Design an enzyme around this catalytic site. Structure first.
Site, mmCIF file in Angstrom:
data_model
loop_
_atom_site.group_PDB
_atom_site.id
_atom_site.type_symbol
_atom_site.label_atom_id
_atom_site.label_comp_id
_atom_site.label_asym_id
_atom_site.label_seq_id
_atom_site.Cartn_x
_atom_site.Cartn_y
_atom_site.Cartn_z
ATOM 1 N N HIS A 152 2.056 4.756 -2.790
ATOM 2 C CA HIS A 152 2.362 6.170 -2.621
ATOM 3 C C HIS A 152 3.707 6.483 -3.267
ATOM 4 C CE1 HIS A 152 -0.857 7.126 0.269
ATOM 5 N NE2 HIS A 152 -0.637 5.934 0.791
ATOM 6 N N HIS A 179 0.833 -1.182 0.000
ATOM 7 C CA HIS A 179 0.000 0.000 0.000
ATOM 8 C C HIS A 179 0.879 1.248 0.000
ATOM 9 C CE1 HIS A 179 -3.200 2.777 1.418
ATOM 10 N NE2 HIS A 179 -2.136 3.387 1.907
ATOM 11 N N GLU A 180 1.945 1.211 0.796
ATOM 12 C CA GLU A 180 2.866 2.335 0.891
ATOM 13 C C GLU A 180 3.724 2.429 -0.351
ATOM 14 O OE1 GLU A 180 1.317 3.092 4.679
ATOM 15 O OE2 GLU A 180 2.341 4.290 3.153
ATOM 16 N N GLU A 184 -4.627 8.347 -1.142
ATOM 17 C CA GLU A 184 -4.898 7.087 -0.463
ATOM 18 C C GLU A 184 -5.720 6.151 -1.344
ATOM 19 O OE1 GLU A 184 -3.674 6.329 2.679
ATOM 20 O OE2 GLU A 184 -2.513 8.156 2.344
ATOM 21 N N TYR A 219 -11.114 3.042 3.838
ATOM 22 C CA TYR A 219 -9.852 3.755 3.986
ATOM 23 C C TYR A 219 -9.475 4.404 2.667
ATOM 24 C CZ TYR A 219 -4.807 4.496 4.847
ATOM 25 O OH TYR A 219 -3.542 5.025 4.994
HETATM 26 C C1 LIG Z 1 2.804 12.420 -0.389
HETATM 27 C C2 LIG Z 1 2.166 11.648 0.770
HETATM 28 C C3 LIG Z 1 1.385 12.328 1.720
HETATM 29 C C4 LIG Z 1 0.804 11.609 2.779
HETATM 30 N N1 LIG Z 1 0.062 12.249 3.683
HETATM 31 C C5 LIG Z 1 1.011 10.222 2.874
HETATM 32 C C6 LIG Z 1 0.420 9.460 3.910
HETATM 33 C C7 LIG Z 1 0.622 8.052 3.964
HETATM 34 N N2 LIG Z 1 -0.007 7.257 4.861
HETATM 35 C C8 LIG Z 1 -0.794 7.658 5.882
HETATM 36 O O1 LIG Z 1 -0.999 8.852 6.133
HETATM 37 N N3 LIG Z 1 -1.322 6.665 6.622
HETATM 38 C C9 LIG Z 1 -2.129 6.804 7.700
HETATM 39 C C10 LIG Z 1 -2.585 5.635 8.351
HETATM 40 C C11 LIG Z 1 -3.408 5.719 9.492
HETATM 41 C C12 LIG Z 1 -3.785 6.977 9.995
HETATM 42 N N4 LIG Z 1 -4.557 7.060 11.115
HETATM 43 C C13 LIG Z 1 -4.926 8.258 11.646
HETATM 44 C C14 LIG Z 1 -5.789 8.297 12.910
HETATM 45 C C15 LIG Z 1 -4.511 9.457 11.038
HETATM 46 C C16 LIG Z 1 -3.713 9.408 9.881
HETATM 47 N N5 LIG Z 1 -3.311 10.540 9.298
HETATM 48 C C17 LIG Z 1 -3.341 8.160 9.348
HETATM 49 C C18 LIG Z 1 -2.517 8.075 8.202
HETATM 50 C C19 LIG Z 1 1.421 7.433 2.982
HETATM 51 C C20 LIG Z 1 2.010 8.194 1.956
HETATM 52 C C21 LIG Z 1 1.807 9.582 1.893
HETATM 53 N N6 LIG Z 1 2.357 10.305 0.879
HETATM 54 ZN ZN LIG Z 2 -1.717 5.531 2.571
#
Ligand SMILES: Cc1cc(N)c2cc(NC(=O)Nc3ccc4nc(C)cc(N)c4c3)ccc2n1
Ligand SMILES: [Zn+2]
Length: 732
Positions: free
Chosen positions: A646, A642-643, A691, A684
């Site tokens: 991104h 999943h990552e 996402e 999600y």
């Molecule tokens: C350019 C970019 C920007 C982001 N914000 C990214 C976030 C992620 N992943 C997540 O933000 N995962 C994630 C997973 C679980 C999360 N849970 C909560 C309560 C809050 C969150 N913000 C949260 C976030 C992966 C790649 C990204 N790439």
């Molecule tokens: Zn993500």
């Protein structure tokens, strides 16, 4: 060679010679016979009040066997043939006053078939009189039995099983073991017998290898652990152990100061956020915002946290749709840091010991550093004493602390008293070593657990290990300990099933070395498979906690699923991009906002993120936290991929116009595909375009082919969009 003495000492107690006029030839014959038995099973017999009587003639003619009912006068020899006590040479009486009666002879050496029987009677004492008091044998032994019955060669069975077991259809379950306790005990004994009598040992190893092996490892190693568990139930033993330790630390204790005791106590029960204070150090303007925020509207404040905040507003009102606001979520982020409990041990676990991490406000960072630096100075005296040798300490743990994802299905959904064998084997799989970065609080003698604690550690402290003594019979250990896992098995205790973990303390440097050599190995291997320069630091192990080894052995597996599900040309182009910007594949057990790849690229601290995984564009690294459970992600692999989505979203949007590094998921064309198909996949995935793209990319590359179809028939314009980017990146 304290060996022979140990046996002499023990024997002068339990062994009673009472013959006619050869009390030296017969008294020496018995010593020859019992000598074959593991010194430790003799002490366990002494433990439960058992005694051995060497006599002449009819053994029934002894005071100890008078109360024998006119039924127990007929026994069966190891071969299953009916006999008569008044015609046999041995008998082990059950009851709360155990008795062993042996006739006199010296031809025990010559006539091996009787020694076999005598040992079989001892084995019976072992499996029925001793092991039953600590709930054994159990699952481990059941596994030996099931290996034998379901093996090809039926000889193993024909040599140890009574027809009752032979004819049983299915395998032997815990339930069976409970209704046929006498039966299993019998098998146990027979195997103990064959193994102990030097002449039949070969037969054992010849027709029942698994039994031989079990009994082999049990009598040479594991048995002293049995004595250990057995002594742990003896009130006086328990009290005796505690006193020697209390004594060993008597000086250290009397010297403690109110300040030292204040520290140890604070380290046992965290200090919760005092609502009041929150309000004060708040702000005139902020109070106003707080005056009305549907706390629930946000999504980064756990149920526990939201409630606290709720009561914060409801406590300031006593005087004169749900849009997701910006500066409001900013306000709620700041408070998240502010409403966390002061928990020293928790701080160590989260940072893996890296107490200088910018993960929380500087004021609080220093208070943690001060308190820890102080606890470290208090716990200076090591366990090593002249009052005792090997020492075992205990700890009851919640599996969620090691692997929340497996913790989800550890307890049987039907019977809460049973543990799922499926998850057990999995959990056990790569559990070789563990690390402690905070202060372990263990018990001197084992104690009952809390419902959510289905893990019962038995730890063998090193004489070197430093610790602190507590009045309630517990020890607080020094941080940064090393632990080698020695055995993992399912045990039954107080009417319930737990996972017993036998572990030995070792120098933390020894465990770190293993991890480091792993990182070297794993990178060598994958730098070859990806065609990266020989010595590039791609993959990195940031391991500091109790499930330590699993984090490492797990990375290998995750990366395998990552190459067998995605086009090799896509991987290479994308990881070359990552490596170019010093990117990293970080597998860790410390919470993400403590991995630098994320924090050295943050504007504000409250802008931190902790979750199963995360991709950081500014550092081009992928972070994967082991312990947690990805809400919509079923396992680590999925999470990683999943990552990687991104990461692709990055390299793709970069190849559009390197003169502007941006996301191809931000493209106008895609903001529309999301406008329409944005709600057909995972919840999600619906969070936002970046996402949604990531969840989609993920399903498309799942191991579950069915899952691939779902995107192709529910996200058409997306399945094609993600495929364009792939081919794009691949060629360009
Ligand atoms: C350019 C970019 C920007 C982001 N914000 C990214 C976030 C992620 N992943 C997540 O933000 N995962 C994630 C997973 C679980 C999360 N849970 C909560 C309560 C809050 C969150 N913000 C949260 C976030 C992966 C790649 C990204 N790439
Ligand atoms: Zn993500």
């Amino acid at each position: 060679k304290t060996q022979e003495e140990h046996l002499k000492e023990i024997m002068k107690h339990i062994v009673k010679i009472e013959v006619k006029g050869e009390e030296a030839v017969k008294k020496e014959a018995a010593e020859k016979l019992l000598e074959k038995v593991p010194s430790d099973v003799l002490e366990m017999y002494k433990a439960i009040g058992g005694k051995i009587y060497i006599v002449d003639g009819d053994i029934t003619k002894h005071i100890s066997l008078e109360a024998l009912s006119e039924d127990k006068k007929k026994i069966k020899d190891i071969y299953g043939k009916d006999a008569l006590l008044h015609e046999h040479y041995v008998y082990a009486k059950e009851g709360y006053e155990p008795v062993l009666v042996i006739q006199s002879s010296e031809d025990y050496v010559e006539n091996t078939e009787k020694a076999l029987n005598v040992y079989y009677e001892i084995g019976k004492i072992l499996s029925r009189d001793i092991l039953s008091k600590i709930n054994q044998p159990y699952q481990k032994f059941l596994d030996v039995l099931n290996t034998i019955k379901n093996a090809s060669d039926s000889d193993g069975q024909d040599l140890l099983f009574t027809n009752q077991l032979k004819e049983h259809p299915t395998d032997f379950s815990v339930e069976f073991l409970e209704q046929n306790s006498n039966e299993v005990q019998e098998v146990f004994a027979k195997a103990f017998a064959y193994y102990i009598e030097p002449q039949h040992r070969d037969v054992l190893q010849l027709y029942a290898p698994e039994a031989f092996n079990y009994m082999d490892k049990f009598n040479e190693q594991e048995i002293n652990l049995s004595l250990e568990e057995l002594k742990d139930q003896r009130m006086l033993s328990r009290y005796e152990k505690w006193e020697k330790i209390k004594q060993h630390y008597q000086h250290w204790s009397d010297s403690l100061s109110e300040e030292g005791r204040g520290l140890l106590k604070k380290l046992q029960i965290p200090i919760e956020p005092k609502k009041d204070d929150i309000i004060h150090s708040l702000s005139q303007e902020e109070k106003e915002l707080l005056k009305r925020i549907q706390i629930d509207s946000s999504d980064f404040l756990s149920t526990e946290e939201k409630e606290f905040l709720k009561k914060l507003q409801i406590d300031i009102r006593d005087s004169l749709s749900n849009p997701l606001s910006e500066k409001e979520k900013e306000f709620l982020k700041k408070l998240k840091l502010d409403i966390q409990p002061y928990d020293i041990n928790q701080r160590l676990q989260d940072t893996g010991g890296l107490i200088d991490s910018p993960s929380i406000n500087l004021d609080v960072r220093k208070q943690y550093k001060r308190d820890i630096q102080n606890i470290d100075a208090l716990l200076h005296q090591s366990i090593g004493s002249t009052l005792y040798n090997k020492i075992y300490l205990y700890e009851n743990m919640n599996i969620n602390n090691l692997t929340a994802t497996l913790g989800a299905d550890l307890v049987d959904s039907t019977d809460n008293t049973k543990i799922n064998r499926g998850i057990f084997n999995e959990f056990k799989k790569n559990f070789k070593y563990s690390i402690s970065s905070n202060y372990m609080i263990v018990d001197i003698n084992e104690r009952p657990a809390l419902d959510n604690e289905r893990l019962k550690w038995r730890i063998q402290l090193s004489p070197d290990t430093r610790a602190g003594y507590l009045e309630n019979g517990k020890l607080i250990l020094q941080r940064n300990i090393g632990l080698e896992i020695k055995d993992v098995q399912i045990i039954k205790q107080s009417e319930k099933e737990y996972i017993r973990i036998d572990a030995k303390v070792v120098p933390k440097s020894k465990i770190d070395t293993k991890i480091q050599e792993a990182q070297l190995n794993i990178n060598q291997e994958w730098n070859k498979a990806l065609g990266l320069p020989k010595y590039t630091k791609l993959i990195t192990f940031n391991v500091h906690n109790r499930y330590a080894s699993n984090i490492v052995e797990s990375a290998y597996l995750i990366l395998n699923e990552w190459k067998n599900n995605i086009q090799s040309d896509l991987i290479k182009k994308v990881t070359n991009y990552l490596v170019d910007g010093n990117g990293r594949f970080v597998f860790t057990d410390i919470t993400l906002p403590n991995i630098a790849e994320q924090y050295t690229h943050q504007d504000e601290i409250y802008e931190q993120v902790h979750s199963k995984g995360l991709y950081v564009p500014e550092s081009r690294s992928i972070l994967l936290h082991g312990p947690s459970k990805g809400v919509e992600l079923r396992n680590d692999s999925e999470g990683f991929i999943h990552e990687f989505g991104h990461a692709v979203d990055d390299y793709a949007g970069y190849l559009l116009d390197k003169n502007q590094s941006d996301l191809v998921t931000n493209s106008k064309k895609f903001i529309d595909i999301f406008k329409e198909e944005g709600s057909n996949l995972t919840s999600y995935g619906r969070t936002n375009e970046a996402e949604f793209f990531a969840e989609a990319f993920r399903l498309m590359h799942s191991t579950d082919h069915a899952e691939r179809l779902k995107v192709q028939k529910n996200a058409p314009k997306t399945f094609q969009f993600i495929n364009d980017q792939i081919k794009f990146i691949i060629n360009s």
